Swiss-Prot record:
The protein's name: Protein MTH_1184
Lineage top rank: taxon: Archaea
A Pfam family this chain is assigned to: DUF1922
Length: 71
């Protein structure tokens, strides 16, 4: 299956189940979860979706703008 992790920049990516420490070709290294892995995506499509949420998404405090509004 597919797995999700987080880069040092606070980023996130997807790979095959078993990646303990990935690497960014841009010039860095991606450290997966502490235990097993973050975001366990079975579907390739769900993988990209899980990573997006795992990304630097400022979604959580729904007080300013409404979800059904702009953001």
């Amino acid at each position: 299956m597919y797995i999700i992790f987080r880069c040092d920049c606070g980023r996130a990516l997807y790979s095959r189940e078993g990646a303990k420490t990935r690497k960014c070709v841009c010039g860095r290294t991606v450290n997966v979860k502490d235990r097993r892995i973050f975001g366990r995506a079975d579907d390739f499509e769900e993988a990209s979706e899980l990573v997006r949420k795992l990304q630097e998404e400022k979604y959580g405090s729904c007080h300013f703008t409404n979800p059904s509004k702009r953001e």
